[PDB]
Symmetry: C3
Subunit: 491 residues, 3 copies
């Protein structure tokens, strides 16, 4: 009963987590959290974004009005989902700069179509084809009007349609490419047709292409599709002496967050802000390894499959040399704090957590967690990142831009976790050392550092005395004479 021992320590856990730091690729901490989202349910949630399942309809075919796509008339979407099983079943066509028209319509997010009163004098309208059947009957794109000769004449068509509204109009039209010179003359009379579609400030002027091509649904001819945007106060003009596949009206254009995605994932009734072709994913983590293609408020795509952020101190079953240093060992029985005191005196032994030092470490770790885990990434219509055809220069560049981006963000994520982990380990070591130093300072000349995180207190120090040290009210003067006598033999 003439001396007491007061030992400082920190908690420990039976199963820790291995994390990476600046100096160690593998080091065990008490707790960590995963920063990379690597799983999806495999389904696209239908809220909060308006999802339109294209089913067997490509957006381009829903736009032109392929007969199997009539149910998509006037549809809207935040995200149009294009299925790989979708196919075209109308007159065979191509779209110079297909990707751009698909993109601009996808971004517009509506197929709202307004029929206009184009006057086509002196021609036969509403041409139909065995390539574009409605049941057994010949048919054609709903939004296009295939004009041919009337009697022995195809006149010079010259028509206008002013835009007197306050929104932009999108016109989609085509040019028919016959298989032979004979077909050219049979349909259009003139041996060389031409289609010129213009506004006051722009024009597209096209000549038909003649030649036999592989039969598609019985047809060797083809249509090429073009588009024209007409702004308020501007006007559409169409001038043709043959081969014109006319528009029936315009699509309203909108701006907003709409886009299109290629996916075969089923749609489900649930809520998720982030969508990938693999399905919706949670956005609670800052990074994800599910797909570079995303839509909505999403974690950033990185190459890593896991990045673990330490959320507790080193686990011992640092710059300051306290944790895993002069303190040999963590305490598994300390579950109400991160740091604390054990003591041994006349009245027995005991353990108490230190609230203030525990809270300081927790507050600092929560601070970095809040910084890191803060959702900051919301992107909608972007660039394409997977490609079905070889194209060369433009595709090389699109791929390189995305690859460059991913490599830079993977770098940021890797560094972030290594630096943060090194600092977490160092600040928790720091808090342990600061509590030790504060205790040392309280004790003045009445105790000695045993070298293992323990003080030998050279006087009788009962439970209330120990509590005075723990709560920062120890009065060293009260015990000094006793202590100096015991330490040094002074009186």
């Amino acid at each position: 009963n003439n001396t007491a021992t007061l030992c400082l320590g920190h908690h420990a856990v039976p199963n820790g987590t291995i994390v990476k730091t600046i100096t160690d690729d593998q080091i065990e901490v008490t707790n960590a959290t995963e920063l990379v989202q690597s799983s999806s349910t495999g389904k696209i949630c239908n809220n909060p974004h308006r999802i339109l399942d294209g089913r067997d309809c490509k957006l381009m075919d829903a736009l032109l009005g392929d007969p199997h796509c009539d149910v998509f008339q006037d549809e809207t979407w935040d995200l149009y989902v294009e299925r790989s099983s979708a196919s075209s079943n109308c007159y065979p066509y191509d779209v110079p700069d297909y990707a751009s028209l698909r993109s601009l319509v996808a971004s517009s997010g509506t197929l709202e179509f307004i029929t206009e009163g184009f006057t086509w004098t002196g021609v036969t309208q509403n041409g139909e084809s065995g390539a574009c059947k409605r049941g057994p009957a010949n048919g054609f794109f709903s939004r296009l009007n295939w004009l041919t000769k009337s009697g022995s004449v195809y006149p010079l068509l010259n028509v206008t349609m002013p835009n007197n509204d306050n929104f932009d109009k999108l016109y989609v039209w085509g040019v028919h490419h016959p298989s032979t010179n004979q077909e050219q003359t049979n349909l259009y009379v003139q041996a060389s047709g031409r289609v010129t579609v213009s506004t006051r400030r722009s024009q597209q002027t096209i000549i038909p292409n003649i030649g036999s091509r592989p039969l598609v649904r019985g047809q060797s001819g083809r249509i090429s599709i073009y588009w024209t945007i007409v702004k308020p106060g501007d006007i559409l003009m169409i001038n043709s002496n043959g081969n014109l596949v006319a528009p029936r009206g315009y699509f309203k254009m909108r701006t907003g967050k709409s886009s299109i995605m290629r996916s075969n994932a089923p749609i489900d009734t649930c809520i998720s802000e982030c969508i990938t072709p693999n399905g919706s994913i949670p956005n609670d983590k800052p990074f994800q390894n599910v797909n570079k293609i995303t839509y909505g408020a999403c974690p950033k795509y990185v190459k890593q499959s896991t990045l673990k952020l330490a959320t507790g101190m080193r686990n011992v079953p640092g710059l300051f040399g306290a944790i895993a240093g002069f303190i040999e060992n963590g305490w598994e029985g300390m579950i109400d704090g991160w740091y604390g005191f054990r003591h041994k005196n006349s009245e027995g032994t005991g353990q108490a957590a230190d609230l203030k030092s525990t809270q300081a470490a927790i507050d600092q770790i929560n601070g970095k967690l809040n910084r890191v885990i803060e959702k900051t990434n919301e992107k909608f219509h972007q660039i394409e990142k997977e490609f079905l055809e070889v194209e060369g220069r433009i595709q090389d560049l699109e791929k390189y831009v995305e690859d460059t981006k991913i490599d830079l963000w993977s770098y940021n994520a890797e560094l972030l976790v290594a630096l943060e982990n090194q600092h977490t380990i160092d600040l928790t070591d720091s808090e342990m050392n600061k509590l030790f130093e504060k205790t040392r300072r309280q004790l003045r000349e009445n105790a000695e550092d045993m070298g293992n995180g323990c003080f030998k207190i050279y006087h009788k120090c009962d439970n209330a005395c120990i509590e005075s040290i723990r709560n920062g009210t120890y009065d060293h003067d009260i015990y000094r004479d006793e202590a100096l006598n015991n330490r040094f033999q002074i009186k």
Copy 2:
């Protein structure tokens, strides 16, 4: 009079500045500096870059030689400033790949035009139009030569111009699309014209299409503009049976720092390396939030409106636990240093700054300031970043490249400031602790740490004695007997 007190401390100010760190979203430091430039004067400075105000002339119209644009003949610029009020007033035209021609001329930075001795046998030159008046007279683009029939014949033109120089020549030429067959035959005799412009390494052939486009300044036809660059030792060949709008010569091409910007900001007499469409901005800060479009030595565009870099210690009106730790409190009355000493002795009280510790903290902070705010970003001709029309694929990519860039730099700036501030707080805490420890070591057995940054010195220690401690010359041996006697009663 037999003991003294020596206290260590650091300065503080009544009102500090809130900054962000890795672990704290809000923490008060003594001083900080702003890293984001958020303001402009609203004017473009006319030095040091050569600014050319386009006024009511688009670069394309100054190039072709629209009659309202004669003052721009042979102009040069580092930055051509294009105003939104600019309009065209000549024959209605379009430029396939308009953006590319505008870009390459802008980047070249000169409209220096060299008239060449082209021979046009058998045609009428200098065609003119009511759409392009010069005063009361019909006129045409100054740099183009509208060729028409002579008598009842328009011959096959076949002309050459070798490049015997050692620089590239830019030729700008056009093809006329008449409104009607009557106009075509009246001008060119041939029912269908053709233009082929070739060199040894390239060829461009355009077959115009006849048809009405909207009436513009009385004209329903259009001219389409094309260009050809002829390398040293190569040869221009022009071949046409009608519809050629011929060049009169070539434009000189240069490489350098020239570009073009769309802005409605007025030009002013002043100096500024950095120009934005909003006006010039200072470049003393590393980041800016004014505009992603810039020219010259500019701060990097980021999303943040403010980023405060700590340039002083924590303000108390750290890893080491001195500042805001065992030192309870900063000293507002300490104004000639950052760290220092106060004492109470036989002669009274006093205060003195510690120069070495003050200077060490200041040098380290100036070090990071020099590193951070060092101007290292100078960009001239870049890509466009705002767009007046919907285009689809290439524009999607241009937008994505820029958004990607901005998000990465915004990340770098945010991390930089958080890391630097955390480190600044820690290094200033460190310097305080090191000064305390140095003082403790000098005192040996002659003093005890009171636990609050103060030492009780256990001997008579007058002003000279205190100064010996402050200046690092204290001789502990001189006072050891006296001190040990007071502490322990040894005598």
Copy 3:
């Protein structure tokens, strides 16, 4: 002989290395390593990548089968090396979108050519030209078939070639533009020809343009080159009434790591994963300043010519204030450790390295080295980064993408080295301090800190005694009474 001195210290070297940190642009460390590769041997190593030296053949000429390029028939490569001296020696031609065809063939990595059963009824095959000699005899591109009239007739050609395989076929074909009407008629009978090449999903119709171009190898006519990819289950059709330069079969298409590089560096026998136009470079460093154009597992291109990473402590011939702090001075005579002890006792003087602290510092530094210099960057076919012609919009974007990437990586590299160096200086300072503190703790009341990294041990401490302190088994209880006496005169 009643006391001993034990001094702690660290090594130093006479000439250290100057590095940069967060706080100092220049600070000397004992050792550093260069992170930027700035040199090449100037030769391209022929392993492990399959390098194909194009010699005087551009890939495009090797593809078409220019007579000087016959040795490249059916070649394959990982990297095609294109020389600046390469020239074309066949009929003059141009390739609309040349860069894309060059890119896609380069990326495919093979010229494997399969002859197919095209039947050309009623025409003369194997046309040849004096512009395209094989020795003294006229010749033509080996992979193309120049068809001309047979007798007095050139009939409408109409042929098909199904893709019944499970791979993609690349067809390369051409259209002849005669110089004169006389030539057109002599070769093809029809006054105006036409070439239509199609599949089920695509079509191209090219109309030849008759007219003079500048003479190249005796020819004022030109051939234009086009290509068509035919997927499994699709069908190629070719339909023409003149001017067709027919394919003889297809090139097999592959995907993989192949690319093309412009370089004049010789190829030699050696091994190198990374190739630049300057020659191969080692990939042991994470960064390089040799060339932005690279192929293989390469360091990342940065703007800096040098970046030195500290791999040793501060050199003295920190946050903790030990190194270049209370320890005045490093020890050059310490060659078997980074930290250690010198002593002075009755038996003389001595020195010993401390293994554990030395190893702790080394292990931490090796940890960051392994992290930093870990080869993680491997790129194959990318985008072009140097250009011979002005092009405008697409080239502006390619350049901007590459410049953006480089500035971001240069930033990352600069920050990495500054941060790592600051931390290395601090952790080595920490390790010195930790050793000092551990020693202090062992000695208890038996020694005093002299303030300069040395302990005065206040008792007889022979060689065995010193060694017990160095190996951590010192028993302070044995000497405590003797020590307190010398210290205060208490025993």
